[PDB]
Amino acid sequence: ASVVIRNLSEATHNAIKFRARAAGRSTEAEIRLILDNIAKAQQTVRLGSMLASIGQEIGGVELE
Amino acid sequence: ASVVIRNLSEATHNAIKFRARAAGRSTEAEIRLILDNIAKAQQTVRLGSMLASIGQEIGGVELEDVR
Amino acid sequence: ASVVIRNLSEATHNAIKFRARAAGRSTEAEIRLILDNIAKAQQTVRLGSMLASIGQEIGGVELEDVRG
Amino acid sequence: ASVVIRNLSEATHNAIKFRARAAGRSTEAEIRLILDNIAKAQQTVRLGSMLASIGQEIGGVEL
Amino acid sequence: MILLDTNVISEPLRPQPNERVVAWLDSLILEDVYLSAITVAEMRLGVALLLNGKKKNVLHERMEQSILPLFAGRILPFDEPVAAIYAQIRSYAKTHGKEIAAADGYIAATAKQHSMTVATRDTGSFFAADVAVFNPWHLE
Amino acid sequence: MILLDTNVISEPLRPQPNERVVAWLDSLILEDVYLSAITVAEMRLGVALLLNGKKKNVLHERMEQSILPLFAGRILPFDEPVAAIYAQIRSYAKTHGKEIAAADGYIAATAKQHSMTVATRDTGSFFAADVAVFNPWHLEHHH
Amino acid sequence: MILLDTNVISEPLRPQPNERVVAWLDSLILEDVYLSAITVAEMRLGVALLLNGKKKNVLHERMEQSILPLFAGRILPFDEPVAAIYAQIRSYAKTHGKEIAAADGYIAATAKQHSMTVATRDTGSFFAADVAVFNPWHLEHHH
Amino acid sequence: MILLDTNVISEPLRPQPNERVVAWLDSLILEDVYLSAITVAEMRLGVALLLNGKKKNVLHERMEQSILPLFAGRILPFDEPVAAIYAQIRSYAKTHGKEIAAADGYIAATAKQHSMTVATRDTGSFFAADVAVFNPWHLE
DNA sequence: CAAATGCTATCAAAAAAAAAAAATGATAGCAATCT
DNA sequence: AGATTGCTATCATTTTTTTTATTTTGATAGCATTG
């Protein structure tokens, strides 16, 4: 999906640009990661059910 | 400035729409904020104001040209 | 163990040929020695003999295998 | 421009191979560079003359 | 600070998964559950050892895109320090009559370095290494 | 990254600092701003040439104990490689009328190697150096 | 670089240590030799298992105060990446005949990542892992 | 050690090079002679400002393959530390009536940094900067 | 002597350049919402 | 009812990724000539 951020404070932009490069990422990828991490937090994964699902989907397995 | 974030997973995207809605604002307003807070956190020192103080401390100085 | 060195500065070659003649060696022998010399310099420690000593100090050990 | 080193102590060879990779260059470049450094240390350049000639070689210049 | 053992993490993937273990895994804070590289290596091998077919391929897909990314950053490595722990744990038990499989010792020493709670079906090995343990096949 | 020339970093310290400039400096991430050893030379000489008294002393401390340390690790030297760029930045300018002075060449040259942008009040010269410049005194528009 | 497997590092410490092996270890430059965390573990446990006495105390000291320190920074952990490699090195060998023991897979896998050569007396396994191997118990021919 | 000011290191190249300066440069042990990037910058610029041609092309060739490689590793950078020295050197001399060209200052400072004897035909400046000087236009 | 040298060679892998494909960074244009 | 917002799109770069040449190593093989 695409998203346009306008009227972004100049400084806030300089700062993000900094984080991105200082980590070897393009600014765009940086923001993309940031928003990604936030989603990650907001979410509470159901580990048990998550797998048992993937297992019921592939007819179940036994990885020893 | 402006920036376009292409190839943003619908998951993350929906997460951010949700966040914004929950927070009572628009998604563009939410991202603008999320970024702002981060930026605020990196802004360790403010070079201008920092130097300004010094100026104000000695009542300003005019340094010889030299070059 | 043998190795070739092509595109060797013609000036460098003579310099080495000279140094070898100055000493009583052949050019190859001189290379071998200027090489062997720095090598011995890199030799900070000799792992083999090192561990051996440790072995001799204790009269030698025989650790269990431990490995499926 | 070509030299062959034989009967070389496989170990001295190791030592070199090592200094070679550590500086990111082929073992050969290494020998080449070693020999090159030897020659430079055996040489005594006469800075004045060496320039004075490059000078007369081009009709003279000023900087 | 919970460290899943191979047999636990892989339980839900089984044919007749134990619902008690699934429920338990579903009660955890993912940002607090770890994995040993040794354990991830065992899972990855389990996948890799499957006969080629759609099955092996979808599983791999998930394993790398869905499962494993959830522990990214928390897959503990078996290093020098941990190797010293391993030696203690195993040498100890062994010289006191309780055997500890290398496989287990690795997880054990790891858990032991960060004071983590090993979650496993075979608690004997870990009680022996003096490591907090939890058998998810039970309650509480 | 941004390379600050002498006149820009001098502004805030003046009697009536230029509002627009200070604000600009304020919108930056310190770790992104750098200084050429040359510029540091100047700032220190500018200080040293003052008349002896309180002002000078205070400013000296501020300079060594406060300003510069913020740039530790980011004060760029004029080393051998930079020299090559230098020779070309100036030569290329002379063969295009617009002359560049040594000092400006040093700074420019430095900036160019590390592919940076010079923030100066006198963009006048630097453009001829084929290097990105930015006048914090002016405004910013469209592209 | 070379990766020493348990059984080699052990050879010298033994009663009548194979001379050919000790000769080869000396023809090495420390900074080039590495150990796997797995291997250190094995060594560390092999010591711990000895009956309590003088021999075990000394060996334990030399072990931790002399030997090991010599590989500081060159002790390779079995991290997540290495695991992926391990997964293939083993599944591969199996669907090809010679099966590999996990322990040996850890070492191989480790070595492979950094494309190192494994020095072991038991080469019979590693070669099946597509990793370069060398037996210091044997003679060198190389073409 | 010895740092060659720009004018000295470039004399031999001039049309009718002064023999006293050439002969002295010949008595030196290359491994003890240095250059400042500043000086190296002007040398290079000097070559750049020549009309493209055989002369320029060869001068350049020689400057990069035959001359500078002789100083490889001994071409002192103008850095922070030096900048401070430079500031003291110029401030003192100047607030005492002896103008020190910023040009010369960069050298005197480089020299004053590592304790070197500067070689130059402009002895006057350097004496004022408290740096060992030597005029290769004379003898001894 | 046979062993050692000094040169030229082979010869199969490793170790700059030319082309093709992504992203990135800057806005630009609208229809549908909120103020 | 003018500003904001959500979605797409244009476009001149950067940045990667992939192909296609060229060079270089490795390693050791000929051959006529001194400890």
Nearest residue of B to residue A22 by CA position?
Answer: B42
Contact state of G27 with D18 under an 8 Å Cβ cutoff = no
DSSP calls for chain C: --EEE-S--HHHHHHHHHHHHHTT--HHHHHHHHHHHHHHHH----HHHHHHHHHHHTT---------
H130 is in an annotated binding site: no
Given phi > 0 = left and psi -120 to 50 = alpha, else beta, which region is A24?
left
**CA distance linking residue H102 with residue E101, whole number of Å:** 75
Please report, to the nearest 10 degrees, the dihedral formed by the alpha carbons of residues E83, E85, E86, E88 taken in order: 130
User: CB neighbours of F126 closer than 8 A, spacing ≥ 6?
Assistant: F100, F104, F108, F118, F120, F133
Which helix (DSSP H) or strand (DSSP E) does residue G107 occupy? Answer: helix G102-113
What domains lie within chain A, and their CATH numbers? 9-58 (1.10.1220.10)
Percent of residues in chain D assigned helix, strand, coil, to nearest 5: 60, 5, 35
CB contact under 8 A, E80 and G37: yes
Distance in Å from J1's C1' to C60's CA comes to: 95
Q: Contact E80/G75 with Cβ under 8 angstroms?
A: yes
Helix (H, G, I), strand (E, B) or coil at F71: helix
- Using a 10 angstrom Cβ sphere, with 0-12 exposed, 13-18 middle and 19 or more buried, the burial of residue D30 is buried
Question: With an 8 Å Cβ cutoff, are H62 and D57 in contact?
Answer: yes
For chain B, positions 25-44, list CB contacts with chain F under 8 A. Answer: 42-44
Chain G contact for E82 (CB, 8 A cutoff): yes
Backbone angles phi, psi at G130, to 5 degrees: 60, 35
SS3 labels along chain E: CEEECHHHHCCCCCCCCCHHHHHHHCCCCHHHEEEEHHHHHHHHHHHHCCCCCHHHHHHHHHHHHHHHHHHCCCEECECHHHHHHHHHHHHHHHCCCCCCCHHHHHHHHHHHHCCCEEECCCHHHHHHCCCCEECCCCCC
Check chain F for breaks (C–N over 2.5 Å) and list the residue before each, or none: none
Q: Which two tokens stand for residue C26?
A: 């052949």
* Chains adjacent to G (≥3 CB pairs closer than 8 angstroms): C, D, E
Q: Which two tokens stand for residue E7?
A: 């047999």
Listed residue (D18, D42, D43, D44) closest to D31, CA to CA: D18
Nearest to residue E2, comparing CAs of E115, E130, E138? E115
Q: What's the rounded Cα separation, in Å, for the pair D26 and D14? A: 13
Torsion angle defined by CA atoms of residues F3, F7, F12 and F17, in that order, rounded to the nearest 10 degrees: -140
CA distance H106 to H120: 14
Q: What is the DSSP letter of F51?
A: P
The experimental technique behind this entry is: X-ray
Would you give the distance in Å from CA G1 to the centre of its chain? Answer: 13
Tell me the C-alpha to C-alpha distance, in Å, between residue F61 and each of F14, F66, F102: 17, 7, 30
Task: Give buried/exposed letters for E2-40 (b at 16+ CB in 10 A, else e).
Answer: bbbbbbbbbbbbbeebeeebbebbbebebeebbbbbbbb
Parent domain of E74: 1-140
- For residue G125, the Cα-to-chain-centroid distance in whole angstroms is 13
Q: What's the reported resolution, in angstroms, to a tenth?
A: 3.0
- Token pair listed for G58: 């000394």
Tokens of residue G18, six digits = 């194979």
How many structural domains compose chain G? 1
On the CB side of H133, CA atoms within 13 Å amount to: 20
Quote the tokens at residue H19: 């023999």
The Å distance, CA of G68 to C1' of J27, is 35
F42 touching B (Cβ < 8 Å): yes
Rounded to whole angstroms, the Cα distance separating A61 from E12 reads 9
Tokens encoding H84: 């401070």
C7: nt with nearest C1' to CA: J24
Q: Which of F66, A37, E81, H80 lies closest to B53 in space, CA to CA?
A: F66
For residue B13, which nucleotide's C1' is closest to its Cα?
Answer: J6
E51 touches chain G (CB under 8 A): no
Angle, helices G80-94 vs E37-48, to 10°: value is 30
Q: How many angstroms separate the CA atoms of F68 and F53, rounded?
A: 22
Residue F142 sits at φ, ψ, to 5 deg, of -90, 170
Closest CA to H122 of H111, H112, H136: H136
Partner chains of E (3+ C-beta pairs under 8 Å): A, G
Which residues neighbour H91 within 8 Å (Cβ) at sequence distance 6 or greater? F45, F48, F49
Q: How far is the CA of F139 from the C1' of I20 (A)?
A: 40
The residues of C between 11 and 40 with beta carbon within 7 Å of nucleic strand I are: 20, 25-29
Task: For chain D, give the number of residues.
Answer: 63
Locate D3 and state its tokens.
Answer: 């030299």
Q: Which residues touch strand J (CB under 7 A)?
A: A 1-4, 6-7, 26; B 4, 20, 25-29; C 1-4, 6-7; D 4, 17, 20, 25-29; G 142-143
Q: What are phi and psi of H134, to 5 degrees?
A: -150, 130
CA distance G11 to chain D (A): 20
Closest Cα in chain E, distance from residue G124 (Å): 21
Handedness of CA E87, E93, E95, E101 (dihedral sign): negative
CATH for F130? 3.40.50.1010
Chains H and D contact (Cβ–Cβ under 8 Å for 3 or more pairs): yes
In chain G, which among 14-43 make CB contacts under 8 A with chain E?
Answer: 37-38, 40-41
Instruction: Confirm if F75 and F68 have CB atoms less than 8 A apart.
Output: yes
Min Cα distance G28 → chain C (Å) is 7
- Using left for φ > 0, alpha for ψ between -120 and 50, and beta otherwise, residue A54 falls in alpha
Nearest to H7 by CA among H49, H35, H48: H35
